[PDB]
Ligand binder design. Structure first.
Ligand SMILES: OC[C@H]1O[C@H](O[C@H]2[C@H](O)[C@@H](O)[C@@H](O)O[C@@H]2CO)[C@H](O)[C@@H](O)[C@@H]1O
Length: 377
């Protein structure tokens, strides 16, 4: 409530570094800043903010913030020209919804292919090499690739490579013969097409040929890679800190091509929104503008867990030499900035089920995506 700041940010992010910025805030103002990382934060915040509660500040990829804003859960952001000029204009665009700044862009997240340089001094260029490459590491007691198959974020780069798309926009009904001609529908879902089917088909066959397991989650994949058990993983910059502390010599590189096409990751801008129910919106601004989005604040979070390419131009210029940030930004450039509209939540839920269903065998790829296509719209 008043005289304190409560902040929510995901557990895989640099929440201890952000607590340090929060302590720097307390030291200067006397205002306590608590940072918490609840599970299913993106689900819990709309539940608890809608009743007027949850945190003063919420951290998530920008794709979820259009829903929060459309439901009135987010305050409008009030940066001056001079403060806006300090961040990249495309980072501001991701947190613009119905023309209003509804969050603070923090950093740019894109998946990259992370590989173990002692098992794999030269990473593979294409997805179609991994099968022959997994069977070669199986003769050394290892495997080629593991990544989280339970979240569609991780499989979308392959799905999108040869044709899958999601250029979601809410658009009005175009049917002369409906009674109601004033409502909107979601256009731009592209998951029941040839390109998406081919992408997810390749993934199912890896599982069917025992190159991956359909139950592999974030934790299983992370442990296997950082224990030297699989030669490659797919993850974002936040995952780098745990590999640094592991004994794995790792590289971060471009995702592999599929049928000659670049993998297209969904790009996220980590965003800091101010709860529309909060009584400390001016303290939230203070903390965000003058403590977090400074070199020293972003530096505290980034060396806890890497943020990726930071939205603050002054600090990104220092990180830009990092070849891992080059890989991040190069993948991000082959992919697409996520839409932020409210139906985004339904799109992710649809695609998650299809991926889990196709991978486990409950549906064919063909059925899974046909269902995904209908649910997303
Ligand atoms: O898989 C669907 C999920 O993908 C994205 O979630 C990412 C998030 O962007 C990252 O910050 C990181 O924590 O990994 C998450 C995937 O586990 C979307 O942001 C999210 O809305 C969507 O549901």
């Amino acid at each position: 409530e008043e005289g304190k700041l409560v902040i929510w940010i995901n557990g895989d992010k640099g929440y201890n570094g952000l607590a340090e910025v929060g302590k720097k805030f307390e030291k200067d103002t006397g205002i306590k800043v608590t940072v918490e990382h609840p599970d299913k934060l993106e689900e819990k915040f709309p539940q608890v903010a809608a009743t007027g509660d949850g945190p003063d500040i919420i951290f998530w990829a920008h794709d979820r913030f259009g829903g929060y804003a459309q439901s009135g859960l987010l305050a409008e952001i009030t940066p001056d020209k001079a403060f806006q000029d300090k961040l990249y204009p495309f980072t501001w665009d991701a947190v613009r919804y119905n023309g209003k700044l509804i969050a603070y862009p923090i950093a740019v997240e894109a998946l990259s292919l992370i590989y173990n340089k002692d098992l794999l001094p030269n990473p593979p260029k294409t997805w179609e090499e991994i099968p022959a490459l997994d069977k070669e590491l199986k003769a050394k007691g290892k495997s080629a690739l593991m990544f989280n198959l339970q979240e569609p974020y991780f499989t979308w780069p392959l799905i999108a490579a040869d044709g899958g798309y999601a250029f979601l926009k809410e658009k009005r009904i175009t049917n002369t013969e409906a009674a109601i001609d004033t409502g909107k529908e979601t256009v731009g879902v592209g998951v029941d097409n040839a390109g998406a089917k081919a992408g997810l088909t390749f993934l199912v066959d890896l599982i069917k040929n025992k190159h991956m397991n359909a139950d592999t989650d974030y934790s299983i994949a992370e442990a296997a890679f950082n224990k030297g058990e699989t030669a490659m993983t797919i993850n974002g910059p936040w995952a780098w800190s745990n590999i640094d502390t592991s004994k794995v010599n790792y590289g971060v590189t471009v995702l592999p091509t599929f049928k000659g096409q670049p993998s297209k990751p969904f790009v996220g801008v980590l965003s800091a929104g101010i709860n529309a129910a909060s009584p400390n919106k001016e303290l939230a601004k203070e903390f965000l503008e003058n403590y977090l989005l400074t070199d020293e604040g972003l530096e505290a979070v980034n060396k806890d867990k890497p943020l990726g390419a930071v939205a603050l131009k002054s600090y990104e210029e220092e990180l830009a030499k990092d070849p891992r940030i080059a890989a991040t930004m190069e993948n991000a450039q082959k992919g697409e900035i996520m839409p932020n509209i409210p139906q985004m939540s339904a799109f992710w839920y649809a695609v998650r089920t299809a991926v889990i269903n196709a991978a486990s065998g409950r549906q064919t790829v063909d059925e899974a995506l046909k269902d995904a296509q209908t649910n997303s719209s």
